[PDB]
Design a binder for this molecule. Structure first.
Ligand SMILES: COC(=O)C1CCN(C(=O)NC(C)(C)C)CC1
Length: 460
């Protein structure tokens, strides 16, 4: 029975509006409704993994698990296994997998982050799950961010708190936040970004939605505009939105958007918005393809419609050679040559690198680099040909060319990371000096760049 080199992943996000679901929710898991939808010919084909995020979820874990599992069994005739379930307040994540995957999944982690302070602490935040699927790390975050059209900056702050403080994945990757710990990271939820148009334009916006003319609305979507200005979700992807705004509907129909201010809304307008989103970030040159992104039309218990996204995702096998794991393979080496970091910092400490990768027995610390001044004000840290030669555990090119090296640049004075990035070993050639490059981030914001050349020796 061969190990897979691809899986499909279903991501669902639904703000349930504190109401129980209707009796049938199968359209959600079938990716049917509006937007980029799944072909009917695939309806019986189970996804490998289903990740369900809910917000304002009124159900117990048991109640929702029974609905989800019975839904999938009706669609696929497969009884899915529960990988993980985690709930913070009314924010929940469920991971289900096909039974054949039970002994491919390990290192399951869960965590939550509570956002805000005092007034603003008590219902918003995020839950997450991570695990290994054979040789591939997978992370999933369901966040319910701050509501209200005039709170985009608070949402951006909520995002940074969640990626700083959510403790998923390999804790040995200590310099790295969740945006670097996984081969594939999926971040979804009620992100609560709104279409920023004047209140007076409510009926005009409704008109546009009825005509399925989303361009002039999407150009005012706060998440797209904040991402384009690098204020949030730096280096994440989102599929093009081709479905109507998923909020705010009158319940029990989809014929009406309920946007006007009410005591129940704190006298706030809720212009039709794409509150409910799926984004992802995968390591460089790993296969990931969005095969659906849309909303259901027939689930109407909430003032939000459910959103679905599905993905092809490249995965690798749990590789054993005669040498590693448990020793190095002298036929393998990674050399970083003529490398330099460009940092935005004004500090003047010395810096060193750390190289982290599951292709190494443990992380590797470099010597300190040589600081110079860049022509436009910047710090340039030069490493020359001084960097330690990295000794992978396995030299086989079918393994090594699928690996990645995480890089942290750390202050000698404080041992704090000033920047993190990732280099793919999926090179055009081995035994050949080739350009490499990663942006460097810290707390998910851009802090610099790392560039240079690599020379990779494999057993071939
Ligand atoms: C399931 O993978 C494995 O366990 C093998 C795979 C290949 N291999 C060897 O060929 N070892 C010899 C040369 C000592 C015979 C290591 C172990």
């Amino acid at each position: 029975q061969p190990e897979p080199d691809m899986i499909t992943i279903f991501i669902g996000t639904w703000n349930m509006g504190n109401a129980p679901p209707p009796k049938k929710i199968t359209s959600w898991f079938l990716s049917k409704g509006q937007g980029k939808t799944r072909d009917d010919s695939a309806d019986y084909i189970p996804h490998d993994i289903y990740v369900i995020g809910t917000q304002e979820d009124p159900l117990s874990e048991k109640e929702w698990l029974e609905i989800l599992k019975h839904s999938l069994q009706e669609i696929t005739s497969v009884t899915f296994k529960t990988v993980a379930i985690h709930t913070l307040w009314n924010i929940r994540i469920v991971v289900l997998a096909k039974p054949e995957h039970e002994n491919r999944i390990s290192h399951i982690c869960t965590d939550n982050v509570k956002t805000g302070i005092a007034n603003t602490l008590g219902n918003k935040g995020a839950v997450g799950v991570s695990f290994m699927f054979n040789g591939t790390s997978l992370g999933f975050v369901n966040s319910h961010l701050t509501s209200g059209s005039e709170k985009k900056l608070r949402r951006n702050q909520n995002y940074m708190n969640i990626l700083r403080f959510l403790a998923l994945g390999d804790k040995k990757l200590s310099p790295f936040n969740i945006t670097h710990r996984f081969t594939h990271l999926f971040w979804f939820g009620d992100l609560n970004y709104r279409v920023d148009l004047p209140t007076w334009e409510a009926e005009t916006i409704i008109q546009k939605i009825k005509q399925q003319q989303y361009a002039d609305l999407l150009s005012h979507d706060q998440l797209l505009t904040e991402r384009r200005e690098q204020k949030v979700f730096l280096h994440f992807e989102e599929e093009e939105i081709t479905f109507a705004p998923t909020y705010r509907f009158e319940r029990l129909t989809r014929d009406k958007y309920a946007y006007t201010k009410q005591k129940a809304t704190g006298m706030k307008y809720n212009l039709p918005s794409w509150c409910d989103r799926v984004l992802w970030k995968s390591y460089p040159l790993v296969h990931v393809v969005c095969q659906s992104y849309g909303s259901t039309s027939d689930i109407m218990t909430s003032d939000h419609s459910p959103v679905f996204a599905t993905f092809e995702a490249g995965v690798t096998s749990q590789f054993v050679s005669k040498n590693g794991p448990g020793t190095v393979d002298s036929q393998g080496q990674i050399e970083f040559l003529r490398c330099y970091a460009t940092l935005k910092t004004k500090s003047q400490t010395k810096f060193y690198l750390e190289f982290h990768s599951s292709c190494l027995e443990s992380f590797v610390k470099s010597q300190e680099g040589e600081n110079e001044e860049g022509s436009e004000g910047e710090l340039v840290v030069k490493f020359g040909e001084t960097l330690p030669k990295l000794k992978p555990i396995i030299s086989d090119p079918e393994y090594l060319l699928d690996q990645h090296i995480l890089i942290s640049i750390k202050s000698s004075d404080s041992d704090e990371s000033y920047g993190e990035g990732c280099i793919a070993l999926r090179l055009e050639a081995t035994e050949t000096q080739l350009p490499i490059y990663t942006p460097l981030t810290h707390h998910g914001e851009l802090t610099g760049h790392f560039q240079g050349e690599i020379k990779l020796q494999t057993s071939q």
